[PDB]
Amino acid sequence: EVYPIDQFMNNTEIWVFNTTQPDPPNCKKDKSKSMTQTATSFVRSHVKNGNIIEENLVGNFTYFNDKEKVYDGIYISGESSGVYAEHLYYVSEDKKCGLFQVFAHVNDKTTIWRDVRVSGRPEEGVPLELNCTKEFDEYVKLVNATSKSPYTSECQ
């Protein structure tokens, strides 16, 4: 069914825990700032050559699903990795794990990938909901993609 991306993104820190993005930078995370009824303002952060880069972005809520009552996606203008749309298509029962379809365009090159994102700092001995990670693993096998985790406990 459909999970409110506006609720998932209303968390202090959302980390990219696993991704099929090719060669992803380390320590990818979003930090919420504020939301209106129709858009969220947030800081998208990652590390490049030891430097923390922070982009102040606006995600405009929209609908991938048919019934158009629950926001499940955002449009993004000017994102530095070329991501123009993100579709939240699954969230765990405990609301800590979310699966994303990511649509990107840079330099006459248009790509898609998928993420497991975690609504908080992952722990040492607390695994994510099994259906969440397994559904992602099913996709990774189906498209024969390579998956990587941008996260380490050393991430600021």
Residue numbers in the entry: 48 to 203
From the study:
In this study, we identify a family of complement inhibitors from the hard tick Rhipicephalus pulchellus, hereafter termed CirpA (Complement inhibitor from R. pulchellus of the alternative pathway). Whilst many molecules act to control inappropriate activation, Properdin is the only known positive regulator of the human complement system.
One protein, subsequently termed CirpA1, was shown to inhibit AP activation of the human complement system, while having no significant impact on the CP or LP at the concentrations tested. Using this strategy, we were able to purify CirpA1, A3, A4, and A5 and determine their structure using X-ray crystallography to a resolution of 2.0, 2.1, 1.8, and 1.9 Å respectively. In addition, OmCI displays a second mechanism of function by binding the proinflammatory eicosanoid leukotriene B4 (LTB4) within an internal binding cavity. The corresponding pocket in CirpA1 is blocked by a cluster of charged residues, precluding binding of a hydrophobic ligand in this position.
